[PDB]
């Protein structure tokens, strides 16, 4: 839609729908498997697993569904890999020891550590704050090596190989204007 | 001369900035049509010219150079006037429509400036056809999709709710809602969301 | 090159000094007595919407009506100035819509050693503009709002573009 | 389209073409058939909640009979309903954006519209009521703008399409605008198959675009993000070789 | 309901009333317009709960009967109402309308626009005194007659040479200049110009006049003549009053305002505007006119004398048989003045007053046809009951005030249409403005006219091209005839009305048009031993006819 200039760029709300609409591991409060009751039956995601489900062991679902089902009780979100203490070590390590390459991450980063951190705060067998604090550290050596980076701008091409949602979108705009504007300036030059 | 021609854009420029600044459709400034019939007065006097010079140039009195500049100065002139004023309706009718897709095609008359008398009687027609052209949109094949709602994607499920406005109590599906001034609900969010859209409702 | 575009309209009206390089009898009638013609070689400053046609129309030895004299915007002193520190420049002073003018001069006149230098000056000044659009307040210095009133036309639009981008983004973050 | 492999793909294209849409510098054809399975789907669904929350409610107000259970009631027809949500929200931002694109680019379209020679037709990019928008829309601003201003310009410029003089008055895209994109490789499972991607050092397969302008040729694998102009790029993302983002 | 209603649960018709009034269209459904719906349900319980079309189309009909209606978002008691007119939509269109309702419309010449005033009445109190004006009323009068006279001069096809404020004379001597103004006297004596911006004299001894206009004090007029900074005098060398303008260009400057609206009105939330339904009613009007004929009557007709009693029987027993549309009777109706009397010996005035309409009551008893068919319309005089009472039978305040209720308390219930107005009055046909106003006009401009140092049928010329020139029933100060402060905008000729009825006792019959307006001047009802009367057909056509 027009409003103003948000016709060029996605708006944060629509990325973290676009986001949250990804599957997630579950592990259920309740059963619902059937008496060998109501079909669940969507249209845009396998029912299967919602209907063929039982307590105590782990499915696959949607996020926003497993989300519905954490505001009551009847879910318990199972965290990923990538938030834990030791992976994050190795991981900014890795960035400290390499200062050219942006590492190896999901391009949901910041955004399910967002969702999770506001929801889903009583499950993590690490504490948050430690975990936030080492977020927060990565986002600003991230941030360094964006701005590092940014000081050449070709007018041909550009490459960003490991660069995330929101990096891209708050980034955007600019990068966009100032290479346009570079490219009209060659064009009419010849 | 198309010295004062200027004079307008620059002020339409600062109309953008009132769109730009608020980034809202609210209080489109009142027009400047004198000076618009104004530029029309003159370039009509330089159509009489023109056509004065080239019934000289065609009598045979009158240089060819001469003819030609000044023809080609005279249709620089009504170009540059036909951009400036094409210029000024292109924006303002941008933001009529900007204003008029939002508010589901009724111009909310009852509520945004009050008369809408700022807008010519030429741009009011066009509103009313642009109002009815909404309204036929979606009377087609989308008549089930509500075109003109929230572009916000949905969030949550329930939301609360703070009236911010007294009226009686309004029916909706499988129940009824009475607003009593200074009251707080706990329901659906995508129940409420016309309400909200028309300002009755406060405290998402 | 928008026709319905503020901008260019706006920057269409700048002047341009030029010459008369051919005579024209009955003419300057708009500026001075209408009985008396201009003679040759007589400088007048002209809009650019007229003087880029009028310098290329030719009209007839097919020699055009007007020659368009080198601008006091486009100099050796600027240049200069510009290789020199582009960053601390106070471009606004010179022109408010120096960029557009650049752009249809170069379009006009081929000439390779203004773009690069033009890229060069534009290309440092981002860096600083991106600087100062992420810093956001958690109320400033004279350094922001006298680096801020240097500014050209078009790069307020690309300054609050990135404000705005980098606003929203901070305000969805902490909530 | 031509068959379902399920509505999940139905879904995930109506997704992707929307953000295409949505950065795309110029108008891009119309998927008929995603839509044509997407209404129906939803007319069907929508019955189908309407059907059981009336049989429910007819039971529950016959008599006073027994509550339904909470369990296994509520929560599936509040999915079916937030799901439905979803997708109405997805579909009206599509088609919101497709009106500014039209609006933007009219003059253009019914330029091009009208030439015999050029291969495509309006039919194929714009929907049934998007002809009527456009025409009605185009009807209304020239009868605007003949009453108010061209009724007293003389007849060497009253027309509205001139392409002579200084300026011109239609806007063509800006093919040459700078966008971000994912290289995708080839839909298929293979992803080796195709004709145009090449090999560089350790394997990495690459396809190979160039650039008229500079001269230069430029390689994009698989998996790293490019910031690269439009012109060049319109088969690759035609092909859904590549994703905008 | 219908012939076998079912009583309804409303949950089970909620969703259905829900769907089509808040997605499709409609919002804010009540529960009084449940109810109303509920009511219509059972006015359609054929196969309903599984008939589909004809429901939700009667509903998108409701839709199409009250979106119209201020702006559709509530439904109140009235559902009902909004279901009779669904029935319904399953010579009238006409209306009178005096100087106390008009719709009150204020200028602006900084904005060039019209503005709607609210009315004191309606949303003030006014239990004790609301009609009443203010104090800067009588200040912003003349300022707002002299805002629509400059619009109207600087709107001609001629002006585009410009005119100059008085207050610019100050510095200027020995050129030419044009202006315009308020001639009056000043209180010195001499013949002074009057602008907003200030105040000059008048050189008349060397000014030849525009021929054809009544030149009185108190009329706009167009000044040319040079300046002298010697003393102060403006010698003028012609003077012209400003011309007029035709109905269609008058209101194309405002689209098609609903000043004298009945399809429609304005108000101070919005303007409103309509010219869809003009060409449909203009073409009805070409239809049946012949048959919707309206008749008047002449001037001064007295109920005391018994030769006019047996004239109007006369005049009644012809027009019994073919009982017009209107029939307009206007004039005095009683030979002398009423005011207080200083006699009980005698029958009082008030007394005769009433009498002298109660015989009437009794002569229209033999008429039933006339009185079955044809409305009633009638206008005070001079010395009716409540200007004579204080102007002695002298003229008076403008803005006359009806005749009192309880002196005509048989004449509304033997007749069935009988209306009282003030003493100018508007009537809006079906594309038709026609106003009647009763005063004497040949006399006053004849007594008042300037003298300028230096066959009947010119003075009615020059009367009409100077009514229309100057645009207002009353072109004269305040000292001549007193207006009420804020009805002066009824006696504007800023609509300019397509017929008007000026009935002038002092001025012989004549059926004139011009500048687009058709006037007629119906004389004395009685003269020379003969009685006449004039019909006016719709069709830009006249007849007089007379019976000894």
Not at chain 1, 96 to 105: A, G, I, N, V, Y
Not at chain 2, 95 to 116: E, R, V
Request: net charge neutral; hydrophobic share 40%; aromatic share 8%.
């Amino acid at each position: 839609s027009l409003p103003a200039h948000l016709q060029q760029t996605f708006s944060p709300e629509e990325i973290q729908f676009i986001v949250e609409n990804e599957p997630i591991k579950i592990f259920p409060r309740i059963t619902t498997r059937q008496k060998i009751h109501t079909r669940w039956q969507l249209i845009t995601t396998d029912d299967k697993a919602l209907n063929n489900m039982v307590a105590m062991r782990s499915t696959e679902v949607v996020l926003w569904i497993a989300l519905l089902l954490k505001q009551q009780s009847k879910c318990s979100i199972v965290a990923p890999q990538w938030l834990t203490t030791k992976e994050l070590d190795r991981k900014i390590q890795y960035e400290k020891t390499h200062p050219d390459r942006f590492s190896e991450l999901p391009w949901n980063w910041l955004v399910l550590a967002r969702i999770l951190f506001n929801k889903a705060k009583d499950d993590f067998h690490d504490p948050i704050h430690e975990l936030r604090g080492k977020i927060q550290d990565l986002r600003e050596i991230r941030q360094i090596k964006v701005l590092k980076g940014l000081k050449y701008l070709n007018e041909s091409h550009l490459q960003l190989d490991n660069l995330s949602l929101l990096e891209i979108n708050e980034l955007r705009p600019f990068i966009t204007e100032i290479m346009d504007k570079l490219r009209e300036i060659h064009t009419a030059s010849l | 001369y198309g010295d004062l021609g200027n004079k307008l854009v620059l002020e339409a420029k600062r109309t953008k900035q009132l769109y730009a600044r608020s980034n809202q459709d609210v209080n489109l400034p009142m027009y400047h049509e004198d000076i618009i019939r104004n530029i029309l007065k003159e370039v009509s006097n330089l159509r009489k010219n023109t056509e004065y010079l080239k019934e000289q140039q065609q009598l045979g009195m009158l240089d060819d150079k001469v003819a030609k500049c000044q023809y080609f100065v005279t249709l620089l002139c009504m170009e540059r006037n036909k951009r400036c004023l094409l210029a000024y309706q292109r924006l303002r009718t941008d933001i009529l429509d900007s204003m008029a897709w939002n508010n589901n095609g009724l111009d909310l008359m009852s509520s945004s400036q009050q008369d809408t008398n700022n807008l010519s009687h030429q741009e009011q027609e066009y509103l009313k056809e642009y109002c009815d052209l909404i309204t036929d949109l979606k009377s087609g094949d989308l008549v089930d999709i509500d075109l003109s709602g929230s572009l916000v994607p949905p969030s949550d499920v329930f939301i609360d709710v703070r009236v911010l406005k007294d009226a009686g109590e309004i029916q909706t599906e499988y129940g009824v809602f009475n607003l009593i001034k200074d009251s707080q609900f706990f329901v659906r969010q995508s129940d409420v969301e016309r309400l909200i859209q028309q300002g009755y409702l406060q405290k998402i | 090159m928008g026709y319905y575009d503020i901008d260019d309209v706006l920057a269409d009206g700048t002047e341009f000094p030029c010459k008369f390089q051919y005579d024209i009898p009955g003419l300057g009638y708009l500026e001075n007595n209408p009985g008396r013609p201009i003679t040759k070689n007589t400088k007048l400053s002209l809009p650019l919407w007229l003087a880029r046609i009028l310098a290329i129309v030719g009209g007839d030895e097919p020699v055009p009506f007007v020659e368009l004299l080198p601008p006091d915007m486009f100099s050796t002193k600027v240049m200069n100035a510009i290789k020199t520190d582009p960053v601390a420049l106070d471009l606004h002073s010179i022109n408010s819509h120096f960029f557009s003018l650049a752009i249809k001069w170069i379009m006009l006149f081929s000439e390779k050693e203004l773009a690069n230098v033009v890229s060069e000056l534009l290309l440092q000044r981002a860096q600083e503009l991106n600087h100062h659009a992420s810093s956001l307040s958690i109320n400033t210095n004279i350094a922001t709002s006298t680096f801020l009133l240097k500014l050209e036309e078009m790069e307020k639009e690309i300054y609050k573009k990135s404000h705005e981008s980098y606003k929203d983004t901070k305000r969805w973050m902490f909530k | 389209t031509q068959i379902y492999v399920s509505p999940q793909q139905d879904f995930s294209d109506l997704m992707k073409s929307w953000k295409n849409e949505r950065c795309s510098p110029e108008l891009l054809p119309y998927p008929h058939q995603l839509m044509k399975r997407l209404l129906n789907r939803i007319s069907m669904q929508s019955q189908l909640i309407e059907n059981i929350s009336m049989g429910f409610l007819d039971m529950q107000n016959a008599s006073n009979a027994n509550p339904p259970m909470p369990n296994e009631s509520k929560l599936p027809l509040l999915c079916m309903e937030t799901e439905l949500e979803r997708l109405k929200f997805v579909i009206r931002s599509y088609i919101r954006c497709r009106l500014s694109k039209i609006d933007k680019f009219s003059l253009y379209l019914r330029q091009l519209n009208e030439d015999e020679n050029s291969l495509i037709s309006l039919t194929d990019l714009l929907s049934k009521d998007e002809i009527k928008y456009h025409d009605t829309h185009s009807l209304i601003w020239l009868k605007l703008v003949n009453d108010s201003i061209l009724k007293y310009m003389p007849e060497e410029l009253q027309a509205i399409n001139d392409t002579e003089g200084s300026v011109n008055m239609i806007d063509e895209p800006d093919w040459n605008k700078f966008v971000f994109i994912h290289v995708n490789g080839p839909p298929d499972g293979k992803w080796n198959e195709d004709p145009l991607l090449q090999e560089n050092e350790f394997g990495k397969p690459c396809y190979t675009v160039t650039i008229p302008d500079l001269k230069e040729e430029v390689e994009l694998t698989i998996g790293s993000i490019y910031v690269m102009r439009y012109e060049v790029i319109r088969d690759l993302l035609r092909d859904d070789k590549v994703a905008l983002i | 309901g219908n012939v076998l209603p079912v009583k309804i649960q409303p949950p089970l018709l909620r969703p259905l009333a829900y769907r089509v009034l808040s997605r499709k269209y409609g919002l804010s459904i009540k529960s009084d317009g449940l109810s109303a719906l509920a009511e219509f349900v059972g006015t359609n319980i054929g196969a309903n709960w599984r008939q589909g079309p004809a429901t939700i189309k009667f509903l998108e009909q409701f839709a199409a009967v009250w979106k119209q209606q201020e702006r559709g978002l509530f439904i109140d008691q009235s559902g009902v109402k909004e279901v009779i007119q669904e029935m319904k939509e399953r010579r009238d269109y006409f209306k009178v309308i005096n100087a106390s309702q008009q719709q009150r419309f204020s200028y602006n010449p900084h904005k060039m626009q019209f503005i709607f005033v609210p009315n004191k009445k309606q949303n003030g109190l006014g239990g004790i005194a609301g009609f009443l004006p203010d104090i800067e009323d009588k200040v912003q009068m003349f300022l707002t007659r002299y805002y629509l006279t400059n619009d109207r001069v600087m709107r001609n096809e001629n002006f585009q040479m410009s005119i100059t404020p008085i207050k610019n004379l100050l510095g200027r001597d020995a050129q030419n200049f044009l202006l315009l103004g308020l001639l009056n006297k000043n209180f010195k004596g001499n013949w002074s110009l009057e602008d907003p911006s200030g105040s000059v004299e008048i050189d008349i001894s060397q000014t030849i006049p525009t021929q054809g206009h009544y030149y009185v004090p108190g009329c706009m007029v167009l000044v040319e003549g040079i300046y002298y900074s010697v003393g102060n005098k403006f010698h003028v060398t012609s003077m012209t009053l400003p011309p007029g303008e035709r109905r269609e260009i008058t209101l194309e400057t405002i689209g098609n305002l609903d000043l004298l609206g009945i399809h429609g009105i304005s108000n101070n939330n919005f303007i409103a505007r309509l010219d869809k339904d003009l060409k449909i009613r203009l073409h009805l009007l070409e239809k049946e006119l012949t048959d919707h004929k309206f008749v008047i009557l002449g001037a001064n007709l007295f109920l005391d004398d018994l030769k006019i009693m047996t004239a109007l029987s006369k005049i009644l027993q012809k027009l019994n048989d073919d009982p017009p549309t209107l029939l307009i009777w206007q004039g005095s109706f009683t030979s002398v003045p009423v005011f207080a009397s200083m006699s009980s010996r005698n029958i009082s005035s008030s007394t005769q007053f009433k009498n002298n309409f109660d015989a009437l009551a009794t002569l229209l008893s033999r008429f039933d046809n006339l009185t079955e068919n044809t409305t009633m319309i009638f206008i005070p005089g001079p010395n009716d009951l409540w200007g004579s009472m204080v102007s002695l039978g002298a003229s008076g305040t403008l803005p006359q005030d009806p005749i009192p209720s309880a002196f005509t308390k048989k004449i509304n219930k033997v007749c069935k249409n009988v209306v009282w107005s003030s003493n100018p009055t508007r009537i809006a046909y079906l594309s038709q403005e026609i106003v009647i106003f009763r005063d004497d006009l040949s006399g006053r401009f004849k007594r008042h006219r300037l003298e300028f140092p230096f066959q009947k049928v010119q003075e009615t010329r020059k009367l009409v091209k100077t009514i229309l020139d100057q645009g207002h029933l009353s072109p004269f100060l305040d000292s001549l005839r007193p207006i009420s402060w804020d009805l002066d905008h009824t006696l504007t000729l800023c609509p300019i009305p397509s017929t008007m009825v000026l009935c002038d006792t002092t001025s012989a019959q004549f059926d004139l048009t011009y500048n687009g307006c058709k006037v007629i001047n119906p004389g004395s009802f009685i003269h020379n031993r003969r009685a006449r009367y004039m019909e006016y057909v719709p069709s830009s056509k006249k007849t007089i006819q007379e019976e000894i």
